[PDB]
Amino acid sequence: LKALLKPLSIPNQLLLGPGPSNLPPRIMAAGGLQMIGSMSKDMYQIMDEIKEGIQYVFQTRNPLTLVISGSGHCALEAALVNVLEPGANGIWGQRAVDIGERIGKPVLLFLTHGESSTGVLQPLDGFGCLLLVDSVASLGGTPLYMDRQGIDILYSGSQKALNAPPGTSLISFSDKAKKKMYSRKTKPFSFYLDIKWLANFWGCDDQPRMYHHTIPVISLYSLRESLALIAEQGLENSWRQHREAAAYLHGRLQALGLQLFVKDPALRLPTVTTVAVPAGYDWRDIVSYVMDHFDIEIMGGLGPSTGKVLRIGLLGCNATRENVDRVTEALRAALQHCPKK
Amino acid sequence: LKALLKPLSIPNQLLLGPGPSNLPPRIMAAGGLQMIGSMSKDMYQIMDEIKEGIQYVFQTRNPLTLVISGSGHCALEAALVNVLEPGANGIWGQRAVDIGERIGKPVLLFLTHGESSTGVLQPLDGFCLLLVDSVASLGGTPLYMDRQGIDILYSGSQKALNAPPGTSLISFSDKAKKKMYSRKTKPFSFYLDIKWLANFWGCDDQPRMYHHTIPVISLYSLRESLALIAEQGLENSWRQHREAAAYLHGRLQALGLQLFVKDPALRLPTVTTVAVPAGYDWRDIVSYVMDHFDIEIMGGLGPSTGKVLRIGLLGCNATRENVDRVTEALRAALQHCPKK
């Protein structure tokens, strides 16, 4: 156990892939804060402000809006096991297919708003069967309006555009979804993710809060500070900085002779950009170059987009033109130095 | 959003219920660090170090051991979904039967080591696959996963390990590993699918493929919690837990209170159940302790509900100073709360 008895040493990395993203000082300082009681009045009050914050960022007043004690995948699978009683795009459609398979004019349609695996900003208008929108990658960096756009179920992640640490996720349900869930003949296959249990604890029904599980208090400090941060900036201020940074990055990226994988600049998700791989180049070599020489994290592909693309993230405090300069200079070095057939 | 835009203010609270507990300087410093790639070489390294720690504190060598991205419930649910292809003690039994029902000479049995809802420690030497819940016991009372031939062992992060709540620890014997890698039917959970999670935690032969985003900061904090327990030593920790629980037991009986668990060999050191003094509202006692001592102690749980109070002694917090503080509080409570 010699390795475990050395002190923890974490290297400095600038994180500019699809996530997770570098944290700002307020959220880090929150992560370092002391514990409080996981059934105290003050935890409940912090949780009620988090509820307000979800209602702001999703643009809803659904009484049933809460935190999922797990990653974005967890908010999705919770949606599925709560709403199912036994369409594909990039990687997230495939994950919805595996979870749907695992359980058993369809009752529910899933759409990826921000396809971080393919870089595409799915159009949303009109599509409002219940509608499930994955906003893990989209939220905060692009317009999304739950109750205006007629979404039934909207879920998002903690660690993308909010720049909280990964491990909590955000979800909200329409009154339609809530009737589907609160009129099931079958119990969902999971206890951890049962919505009547999660709903009772998060204060969304008429009963006082019962013990279900122990919520992640410190992650909730960091998420509360994240939601206070995006609320102070403003939804449209964030949307604007993300569109401007995505335009600037596209500009420099084509300016180096690289080809943005999705043609229409209107169908490009600002938070995650996809870039086709320059011919006669090992994409692994180029990612390796960016980390090895500039401390900068860029991604390859994921699922279908694997081997076809590099992926770039512009998430909250990281969606800066200074970071776009650093990533451009790093890929410039990588193109001129990684061996070319 | 008036509330959200006030700055975060957390109260000073000394937490002495069944978990979670206050954090040490090291785990507050670990929680406050900067992000890194959730699939960088260093992330894998912190993950490999957490695995060695899960092996040390479980007393196993099972290659199939990893952290679960969820609370105690999530490790229990994950083991249950992965090893079941479709016995009751306190609250944790009811959770096991609830999950079992959710799916559908048995193949596996679940036993709680430290039943936190009753305060009963239970022997595992003597004891089909074996599943043991060590969420409250781990680090505070003897446990040897291999020597005691346990098939699935799990614990929680927010008890004696003193890590923040939200992670789980799990370990599988080669027997459970064969049961789970020879399933006709796929588990009902992808988030908790063991072949995927085993791959990502470096537990199989294939390079680590993307499954879910591990809670990077949670994992810094957990590595440290295991580094702290490894530095002290398991036997020193077990000792400190037994001595602190004996001290508390003594000071509690001194006040005219009667421990709910009479046989001291059947007393979990980490979490103490105390009978409710007759002619007392238990809520009044708990509220007076919070309001007037800034201290959390809890009531009962599940069957044990309305029958008991509970007092926790967890890792760095299981000190004689805290037994003294909680004794002085409950002293003041019995003399002021109204008594039929």
Side-chain angles (χ1 to χ4, degrees), chain B residues 154-177 179-183 185-188:
Chain B
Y154 74 80
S155 187
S157 63
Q158 77 267 28
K159 275 130 211 237
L161 278 170
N162 303 131
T167 39
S168 285
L169 290 76
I170 204 153
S171 194
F172 297 93
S173 67
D174 290 32
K175 265 188 151 204
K177 187 160 163 191
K179 174 84 162 82
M180 284 176 318
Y181 275 59
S182 95
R183 280 184 57 129
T185 48
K186 278 193 168 175
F188 291 133

Side-chain angles (χ1 to χ4, degrees), chain A residues 120-134:
Chain A
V120 315
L121 169 48
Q122 161 70 39
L124 281 192
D125 272 336
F127 291 88
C129 169
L130 297 130
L131 185 52
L132 175 45
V133 170
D134 167 330

Side-chain angles (χ1 to χ4, degrees), chain A residues 142-175 177-178 180-184 186-188:
Chain A
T142 181
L144 171 89
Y145 309 82
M146 205 196 167
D147 287 350
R148 180 218 264 191
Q149 288 152 339
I151 311 154
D152 283 306
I153 310 141
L154 183 57
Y155 75 87
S156 198
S158 69
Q159 87 281 16
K160 259 127 219 233
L162 287 167
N163 310 113
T168 85
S169 39
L170 300 68
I171 204 156
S172 198
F173 289 97
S174 72
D175 277 357
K178 176 162 161 189
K180 178 40 158 82
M181 281 177 314
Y182 279 64
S183 95
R184 288 197 34 182
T186 58
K187 285 185 166 170

Side-chain angles (χ1 to χ4, degrees), chain B residues 71-81 92 95-96 99 110 131 154:
Chain B
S71 84
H73 279 82
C74 197
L76 171 69
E77 178 148 273
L80 286 209
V81 296
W92 308 123
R95 301 277 148 136
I99 300 187
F110 159 85
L131 166 44
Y154 74 80

